Amino acid sequence: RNYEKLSIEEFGAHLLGTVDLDPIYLALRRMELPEAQLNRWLLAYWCLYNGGEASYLSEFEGREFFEMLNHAAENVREAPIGGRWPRGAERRHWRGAQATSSVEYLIDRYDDRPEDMAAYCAGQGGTFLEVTKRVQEHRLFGPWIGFKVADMVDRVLGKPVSFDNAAVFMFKDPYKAACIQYEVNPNIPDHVLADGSVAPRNRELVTPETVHHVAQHLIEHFKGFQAPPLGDRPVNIQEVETILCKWKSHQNGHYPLFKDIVEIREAALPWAKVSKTAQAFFEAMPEVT
Amino acid sequence: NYEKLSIEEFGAHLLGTVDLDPIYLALRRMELPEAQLNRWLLAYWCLYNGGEASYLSEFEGREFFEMLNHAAENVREAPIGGRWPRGAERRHWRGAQATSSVEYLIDRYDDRPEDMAAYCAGQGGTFLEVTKRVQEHRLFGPWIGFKVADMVDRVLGKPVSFDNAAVFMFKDPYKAACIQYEVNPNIPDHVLADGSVAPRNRELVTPETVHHVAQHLIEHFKGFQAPPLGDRPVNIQEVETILCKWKSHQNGHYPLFKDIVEIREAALPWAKVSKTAQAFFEAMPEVT
DNA sequence: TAGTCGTCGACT
DNA sequence: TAGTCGACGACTA
Ligand SMILES: [Ca+2]
Ligand SMILES: [Ca+2]
């Protein structure tokens, strides 16, 4: 179907009002999983980007967790829901030798303590750069997941992660989305450069400093929204990075309204039958309006 | 200009006149204490200048790195007067690259500069193992890794197996082997596993043909015992040096005795500022 | 006989 | 909202 394309201000307002921005964060907060399980759930989720599967895997411990993760990485043995071991679209490439070498890296480093990976990435928080560099130590973990982890370390784990001036470090898609926005969104004021000249409204010549000008205007725009999952602070670059990215998909025909909440529940219902944590995941998931 | 020799005749010259690698003989003769030898080597592996390395080898602990950072910065004068010299092979060990290299060594060895060469040497091992240890250090890449690995065996006497190392030789010796298969009629045709003959064309030489070339030259020089002490027949380590120096000879950049002549001229000044530098100059082999 | 870096394209 | 590999050219007095 070919739906109405919304402005970023209205599409973002929907993402915030319906908690369709990042529903996994709400569900996770609702589950109140114990620490070691939460860390296993997270490492699984950052590998496969599938909430129900991470729930199933979060119930295995120690070397039995990595053994079950290597089975999902090899995707030869069937899955407890039947079929192959599913991947989230953002992790579609976590397969073959890339997935298995990834698991050998983690097994070599964490041995019988898989809970330590998220604990090490989380630390006691820190700056976005410090957190993302810790994430990016692990094989098959790059710039997208580093940013995602840093978001979750703050939104889910409650550690203090400073994202100040991260806009220039956003992953290619939210960054390209900021470039398009400077060109096409008239509500974004002109970016007056230090020489007094205006930055050209051309997505192909948008510099890091204009992306920062873009993100800073959007943050101010949404400042009347408290950030989900708990509404503890106003929106910052972490939510704006997500609004930027999903808006580009929305405009491209690849993000109809509620896409994430609908997609999460559909792929998670099978797992709700093989794992009590998966059943708690599906029931903690928010719903469409 | 000068007469360009075949590899067989040019290599025989390098072996007979100890012009192949004269620093190894000089080092063996100096018989320096263990910790100083490791400091001499680390300095040489950064600056590739024997006299300069000899001078710096006499400072110990953190005073060694302070003086090495001075050579890396090249802003204070040098005890020889002028700038802190570099060997041509280390012409790029300068600026932020040199200081980054030295900072890396300080961060890792602190007050024990002797530990760098000892870690590289370990108890020996495979060429591959040693060059990977060497190449952990900043501004240490494949050329110096192969060089250090050669020196751990030729100078430090630890057992380094170089078997089948031909396919790993650095850019220039490897290109020398490619040129050699094209131009040297003494190298027999390389018959591949499928029975086909590899073409006599330097731009289409594969690793297995480079190995085949290296293996033929090893056999050719097998009547030569390897310097510095003639403990074993020539292997891929000397042939790799003959290959590269022959490519240079052919390019006009290595007339006979080039290395022995250049080292002594760049080392004489240092003989006056360091007792070790004078012993180095006196242990250095001579022309003819 | 130099080593390091970033871009790009191909691959999974 | 993916990450890794190798090939290549530019750069470093
Ligand atoms: Ca995001
Ligand atoms: Ca050599």
Paired residues of A234 in beta bridges: A226
Q: Strand D footprint at Cβ < 7 Å?
A: A 89-91, 93, 98, 136, 139-148, 170-174, 241-242, 245-246, 249; B 74, 92, 94-97
From the Cβ of B174, is strand C under 7 Å away? no
CA atoms within 13 A on the CB side of A281: 32
User: How far out from the chain centre does Cα B265 lie?
Assistant: 18
Q: Which two tokens stand for residue B77?
A: 């004068």
Interstrand relation of B125-126 and A161-162 (parallel, antiparallel or unpaired): unpaired
Q: Residues 6 or more apart from B229 whose CB is under 8 A from it?
A: B28
Cα distances from B235 to residues A273, B205, B218, B222, in angstroms, run 67, 21, 6, 8
The integer distance in angstroms from the CA atom of B98 to the C1' atom of C6 is 21
Cα distances from B251 to residues B4, B46, B132, B246, B255, in angstroms, run 9, 26, 31, 8, 10
Alpha carbon of B211 to ligand 2 centroid (Å): 16
Question: Closest ligand to A228 CA?
Answer: 1
In angstroms, what is the resolution?
Answer: 2.3
Yes or no: say if A255 and A189 are a contact pair by the CB < 8 Å rule. Answer: no
Q: Of A49, A53, A56, A52, which is closest to residue A89 (Cα–Cα)?
A: A49
Alpha carbon of B237 to ligand 2 centroid (Å): 6
From the Cβ of B248, is strand C under 7 Å away? yes
- With tokens 């993760």, the residue in question is A69
Nucleotide whose C1' lies closest to the alpha carbon of residue B247: C1
- DSSP-derived letter for residue B225 is B
* Torsion sign (Cα): A263, A267, A272, A278: negative
Q: Which two tokens stand for residue A5?
A: 């394309």
Closest CA to the C1' of D12: that residue is: B92
The integer distance in angstroms from the CA atom of A199 to the C1' atom of D6 is 37
Angle at B40 between CA B36 and CA B43, to 5 degrees: 135
Yes or no: say if A110 and A116 are a contact pair by the CB < 8 Å rule. Answer: yes
From the Cβ of B147, is strand C under 7 Å away? yes
Yes or no: say if A62 and A42 are a contact pair by the CB < 8 Å rule. Answer: no
As a whole number of Å, the CA-based R_g of chain A is: 19
Q: Which two tokens stand for residue B27?
A: 């080092």
Give the DSSP letter string of B149-167.
Answer: HHHHHHTT---EE-TT-GG
From the Cβ of A139, is strand C under 7 Å away? no
| Among B31, B240, B282, B286, the one annotated catalytic | B240
Q: Which two tokens stand for residue A236?
A: 């910052």
The integer distance in angstroms from the CA atom of B92 to the C1' atom of D4 is 30
Q: Residue B106 corresponds to which amino acid?
A: I
Alpha carbon of A14 to ligand 1 centroid (Å): 16
Helix axes B95-109, B114-121, angle to 10 degrees: 80
| Among A53, A61, A241, A283, the one annotated catalytic | A241
Q: Which two tokens stand for residue A191?
A: 């970016």
Nucleotide whose C1' lies closest to the alpha carbon of residue A92: D2
Question: Closest ligand to B142 CA?
Answer: 2
Yes or no: say if B13 and B259 are a contact pair by the CB < 8 Å rule. Answer: no
The ranges assigned to domains in chain A are 8-174+210-254+261-278
Nucleotide whose C1' lies closest to the alpha carbon of residue A98: C12
- A112 backbone dihedrals φ, ψ, rounded to 5°: -100, 10
Alpha carbon of A37 to ligand 1 centroid (Å): 23
Burial of A104 (0-12, 13-18, 19+ CB in 10 A): middle
Cis peptide before B85 (omega within 30 of 0): no
The integer distance in angstroms from the CA atom of A233 to the C1' atom of C8 is 41
Alpha carbon of A203 to ligand 1 centroid (Å): 21
Q: Residues 6 or more apart from A39 whose CB is under 8 A from it?
A: A114, A115, A116, A117, A118, A119
Q: Residue B23 corresponds to which amino acid?
A: I
Question: Closest ligand to A245 CA?
Answer: 1
**Cβ neighbour number for residue B114 with a 10 Å cutoff:** 21
Paired residues of B233 in beta bridges: B225
Yes or no: say if A199 and A206 are a contact pair by the CB < 8 Å rule. Answer: yes
Residue B240 is among the residues annotated as catalytic for this protein: yes
Q: Of B197, B200, B198, B243, which is closest to residue B218 (Cα–Cα)?
A: B243
Question: Closest ligand to B243 CA?
Answer: 2
Cα distances from A220 to residues A167, A216, B83, in angstroms, run 14, 6, 57
Distance (Å, whole) CA B269 – CA B279: 13
Distance, first Cα to last Cα, chain A = 20
Question: Closest ligand to A177 CA?
Answer: 1
Burial of A215 (0-12, 13-18, 19+ CB in 10 A): buried
Query: Method of determination?
Result: X-ray
Strand D, nucleotides < 7 Å from a protein CB: these are 1-4, 12-13
Nucleotide whose C1' lies closest to the alpha carbon of residue A249: D1
Nucleotide whose C1' lies closest to the alpha carbon of residue B95: D12
Alpha carbon of B175 to ligand 2 centroid (Å): 14
DSSP helix/strand/coil, B259: helix
Yes or no: say if B260 and B194 are a contact pair by the CB < 8 Å rule. Answer: no
From the Cβ of B251, is strand C under 7 Å away? no
User: How far out from the chain centre does Cα B250 lie?
Assistant: 20
From the Cβ of A202, is strand C under 7 Å away? no
Paired residues of A190 in beta bridges: none
The integer distance in angstroms from the CA atom of A68 to the C1' atom of C12 is 22
- A11 backbone dihedrals φ, ψ, rounded to 5°: -65, -40
Per-residue HEC secondary structure of chain A comes to CCCCCCCHHHHHHHHHHCCCCCHHHHHHHHHCCCHHHHHHHHHHHHHHCCHHHHHHHHCCCHHHHHHHHHHHHHCCCCCCCCCCCCCCHHHCCCCHHHHHHHHHHHHHHHCCCCHHHHHHHHCCCEEHHHHHHHHCCCCCCCHHHHHHHHHHHHHCCCCCEECCCCHHHCCHHHHHHHHHHHHHCCCCCCCECCCCCECCCCHHHCCHHHHHHHHHHHHHHCCCCECCCCCCCECCHHHHHHHHHHHHHHHCCCCCCCHHHHHHHHHHCCHHHCCHHHHHHHHHCCCCC
Yes or no: say if A40 and A114 are a contact pair by the CB < 8 Å rule. Answer: yes
Strand C, nucleotides < 7 Å from a protein CB: these are 1-4, 12
The integer distance in angstroms from the CA atom of B171 to the C1' atom of D7 is 15
Alpha helices in chain B (DSSP H): 7-16, 22-30, 34-47, 50-57, 61-73, 95-109, 114-121, 127-134, 142-154, 171-183, 207-220, 236-251, 258-267, 275-283
Yes or no: say if A138 and A174 are a contact pair by the CB < 8 Å rule. Answer: no
DSSP helix/strand/coil, B63: helix
Yes or no: say if A44 and A57 are a contact pair by the CB < 8 Å rule. Answer: yes
Distance (Å, whole) CA B43 – CA B45: 5
- A3 backbone dihedrals φ, ψ, rounded to 5°: -80, 170
